[model samples]
Target: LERVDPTTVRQEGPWADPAQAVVQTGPNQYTVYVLAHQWYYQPNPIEVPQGAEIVFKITSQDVLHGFHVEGTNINVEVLPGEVSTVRYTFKRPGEYRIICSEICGANHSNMFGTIVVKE
Candidate 1:
């Protein structure tokens, strides 16, 4: 992904400047906007429609960060101000944890959230 102007960001905590991401599953397609936090994620649960293609438009608000879908190989690096997109199709109903794989701060270990694929 292309790295943008990180210094120009407003929020400096985990979960980008917006602190949240939402993706609605549709006819085999979906779009997700994620904000990388300076320390931890902002929310606990994410919402998504089942059996849809998940396109994660992930970006960092401050520092370089990584997004990983737990138990799967969906991992990506998102740079400040830059947008990184990852596409995936949900084949089952379940909850998935999306975690930051980089040390952003003291709360790095707790920097995580969930992606809920609803049937």
Candidate 2:
């Protein structure tokens, strides 16, 4: 994925950038971001449709971070200057939390995000 201007993004953060946040490329298909920073993940409270094909394109602007979807097989490392990706289908309607599994620094426990699957 090509990187866009972060300043143009007003929806997501630690950069206040939407460049790599999220995108809906097609029906039931999405391109989402797991943007990592000092203490949080951008595009938090991610929304997706149930049973949809979701593509997560993750990256970090700072050091390093991790992304894992609880109760499912989607886990990846978000590294700076590198774009890692994973795909999954939310089989049911529920809420999933994305936990930071890698040790980076303080406030590590605060590094968490949300993924909401809609029916």
Candidate 3:
């Protein structure tokens, strides 16, 4: 993978200046840019339609972190300056918990979010 500059990634990256937390690319297709920071995710409580093709482009702003969605196959290590992409479709409408599986810092335990899939 090519080396990425964290500053550029934060200043002029795809996740930067997003119109909304979730951007619809096509019919029943959506893209979400997630920025993992010191203790939380930028688009907290990610909302998406059920059965939609969701593409998550995740990157860290500071250090190493892990992105794991409870009850799903989406699990990957989020690295600073590098983007980690994962695609999944919510088969049902419910709230999926997002937690940091990698130790980030003092507030790692509190670093969590939710993905709300609407029917």
- The most accurate candidate by TM-score is 3
Per-residue lDDT of model 3, residues 1-119, tens digit only? 53467767657767666456598999999999888889998787899999999999888878999999999999999998787889999999999999999999899999998899999
Please give the lDDT score at residue 92 for candidate 1.
78
Which residue pairs clash within candidate 3?
Answer: none
Off by over 4 Å in 1: 1-26, 42-44
- Per-model TM values vs. the true structure: 0.76, 0.82, 0.91
Off by over 4 Å in 2: 1-16
* Deviating ranges (above 4 Å) for candidate 3: none
The lDDT per prediction is 0.70, 0.77, 0.88
Find the 10 residues in a row with the least total lDDT in model 3. 1-10
lDDT of 2 at 76: 81
Candidate 1 accuracy as TM-score: 0.76
- Residue-by-residue lDDT tens digits, candidate 2, 9-110: 334542355454567888878878667777787777888889889988777777678888899998888777666779999999989998988887998888
Cα displacement (Å) at residue 33, model 3: 0.3
TM-score of 2: 0.82
Cα deviation of 39 in candidate 3 (Å)? 0.3
- Which window of ten consecutive residues has the lowest lDDT sum in model 2? 5-14
Q: Write the per-residue lDDT of candidate 1 for residues 14-119, one digit (tens) a residue.
A: 2343534564455667676666677654345667777777788777767767789887778888677787878887777899988888767777787787888899
What ranking emerges by lDDT with the best candidate at the front? Answer: 3, 2, 1
